[PDB]
Every structure is written in structure tokens, then in C-alpha cells.
Design a binder for this molecule. Structure first.
Ligand code: R97
Ligand code: NA
Length: 330
């Protein structure tokens, strides 16, 4: 089997991407944030505290003939950005782009933090990291990918995120029309439950490539590119008037600037992030100070190749017995 679904940026900045997901019988279609940095499929629901819902579409398990309470199971998650949610668990049929899993754990939110409430466009998350990070207690649950894997034509999914445009998540096949050149594969460590890999270095604009190992994760659920302070300082030094602002919480730059590109290494291959991808617009409405898309990881404890980086590539998440990542230009 395969599946193919379109993913759409929620706003004009590409802060996140939503993908329609069918849950239950008859189908209830919710727009979920596919997150390769977490491992829970959770949804706003008929159980969510009424005051923490503002415009989301909810899952109502009592209207699904295939929904079953997973008795005793609870979940609770905190993300790197400080947000959180928690609740109880159903199993139900879940389909993505024509690929169907029966008995998927669908984590029903009773509570969500303010950042979720205030994002009317995201109806929940679909985690695509390794199932060792799943938060369900007392019986940890599998991701949608892990449950689908045995059925797929090839134990893979791919992320093809758009810049200010829709893109695609495919499951079970690699669309050889969706990228240019060849795919370079690189080793993955699953020791922290992430798609963790080591970039071979970077360049800023038309500068020389610096060969240096940068361990980090491929995370579709993180907006920005978080890298070591040395790398980030080298990038923003090439933008007149850029500075790190403690008040704003990162590097800002004059909205009048033209940003340089940023290149990252994947083995001997190179992925180029155009400068425009690194513009996240005014820090507040009408400001002439713009927020940068490359930020320091120094206060995180891990480097994160988030959407800024991933949308410059066609990315293969290879879930074979020994997982690997692949990157191609596009
Ligand atoms: C700055 C940003 C990135 S994604 C997003 C939307 C969001 C964040 C947290 C919870 C729910 N929705 N805002
Ligand atoms: Na922000």
C-alpha cells in the first residue's frame, strides 16, 4: 500500500503545515500537524475543555462506529516550545492520503496549552518520530507510520514541504519526479527517539564551505533552523544591522535586508536554503525589525533542522530495520 496527502502552510509565514487526516467511521476529517520530532497522534475532541477550544475541528469518538476506549490509558506531552496537551486514548481507523491503519491510538485531548487553543488551524498532531517517544501510559502506543510500515510497498515516508505553497507527504514510495539529481542518504541514530543525523558542515551565501560535524534532528514540527551559536553568528554577521535581541528572543534583522542563502552538508552533497526562506517577517505588526529563520540552539540542548531547512529539500525518512535519512535538492 501507499498514501499521498497534500500539506498546506497554515499562514503566510509557513509557521506550520497541516495535512488532512480521516479518523473514524464515518470519516471525521481533521487537519493535523505532521511532526517528525514527536510520537503522539493527538486531537482536539468532544472531551477537550470547552474554554480551550477556539475554532478547531474536533474528533467525537461517540460518533465513530469503529472507536474503542483504550481502557486506563492516558497521555501527556510537553513540546520544546513549552506547549502541552493531555488526555485519554481511543483506538480507531485512521487514513492519510488513502493509506488506512486500523486500531491506531488516537489520543483525545482533555486539556491543551494556550498556544494550541490560539492556533485555530491545527486540529492536533500526528507524530512521526520513533515510537519509543510515545507518551501513552501504561502501555506505550505506536505511531501511524510504525503501524502502517509492514503494509507499505517500501518502509518509508517522504516530506516535500513547500515555500509559501502546498507540498506533499507520501507513505510507502519515493516519487522520483519530485526532486532533482540524486538522493543522498545519511546515518540515523534512534538513541533519543528522533530522526537524528550529522550534517557535514555549512556555508553562508557564496562563502566557502566549512567542514564540521553538526548533530541534529530532522523535525517537521519545528518552524525554524536551530544551530550552534558559532554557525548562527557567522550567518547573521553577513546581514547589515542583524543582532541577537534578548527582548525579542533571537536574531532580528532589518526588514530592508536581502538575506544570504545558507547551505548545509549531507555527506558530500549540499542543500541550499535560499535567503528568502530565512525571513519570518516583522517581529510585531508594522515593525521594520524582522525575525530570523536561523536561530541558536544553545538554550535547547539539540540542533534542529526544522521546516526552514527541510522545505529546501525532498526528504526521505527511511524506516528500514536500520533507519536512514535521505536528502535531495528540488
Ligand atoms: C510561531 C508558531 C509556530 S507554529 C504556531 C502555531 C501553534 C503553536 C503552538 C500550538 C499551536 N499552534 N505558531
Ligand atoms: Na515567534
Amino acid at each position: 500500500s501507499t498514501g499521498s496527502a497534500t500539506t498546506t502552510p497554515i499562514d503566510s509565514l509557513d509557521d506550520a503545515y497541516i495535512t488532512p487526516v480521516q479518523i473514524g467511521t464515518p470519516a471525521q476529517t481533521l487537519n493535523l500537524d505532521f511532526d517528525t520530532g514527536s510520537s503522539d497522534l493527538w486531537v482536539f475532541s468532544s472531551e477537550t475543555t470547552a474554554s480551550e477550544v477556539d475554532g478547531q475541528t474536533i474528533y467525537t469518538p461517540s460518533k465513530s462506529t469503529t472507536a474503542k476506549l483504550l481502557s486506563g490509558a492516558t497521555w501527556s506531552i510537553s513540546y520544546g516550545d513549552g506547549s502541552s496537551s493531555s488526555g485519554d486514548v481511543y483506538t480507531d481507523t485512521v487514513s492519510v492520503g488513502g493509506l488506512t491503519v486500523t486500531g491506531q491510538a488516537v489520543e483525545s485531548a482533555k486539556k491543551v496549552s494556550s498556544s494550541f487553543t490560539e492556533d485555530s488551524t491545527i486540529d492536533g498532531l500526528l507524530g512521526l518520530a520513533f515510537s519509543t517517544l510515545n507518551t501513552v501510559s501504561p502501555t506505550q502506543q505506536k505511531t501511524f507510520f510504525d503501524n502502517a510500515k509492514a503494509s507499505l510497498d517500501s518502509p518509508v515516508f517522504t516530506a516535500d514541504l513547500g515555500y509559501h505553497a502546498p507540498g506533499t507527504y507520501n507513505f510507502g514510495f519515493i516519487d522520483t519526479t519530485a526532486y532533482t539529481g540524486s538522493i543522498t542518504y545519511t546515518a540515523v541514530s534512534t538513541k533519543q527517539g528522533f530522526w537524528e543525523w550529522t550534517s557535514t558542515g555549512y556555508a553562508v551565501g557564496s562563502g566557502t564551505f566549512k567542514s564540521t560535524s553538526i548533530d541534529g534532528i530532522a523535525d517537521t514540527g519545528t518552524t525554524l533552523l536551530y544551530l550552534p551559536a558559532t554557525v548562527v553568528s557567522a550567518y547573521w554577521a553577513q546581514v547589515s544591522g542583524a543582532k541577537s535581541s534578548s527582548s525579542v528572543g533571537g536574531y532580528v534583522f532589518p526588514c530592508s535586508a536581502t538575506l544570504p542563502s545558507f547551505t548545509f552538508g549531507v555527506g558530500s552533497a549540499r542543500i541550499v536554503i535560499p535567503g528568502d526562506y530565512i525571513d519570518f517577517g516583522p517581529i510585531s505588526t508594522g515593525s521594520s525589525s524582522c525575525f530570523g529563520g536561523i536561530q541558536s540552539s544553545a538554550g535547547i540542548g539539540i540542533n534542529i533542522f526544522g521546516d526552514v531547512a527541510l522545505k529546501a529539500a525532498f526528504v526521505v525518512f527511511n524506516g528500514a530495520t536500520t533507519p536512514t535519512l535521505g536528502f535531495a535538492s528540488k
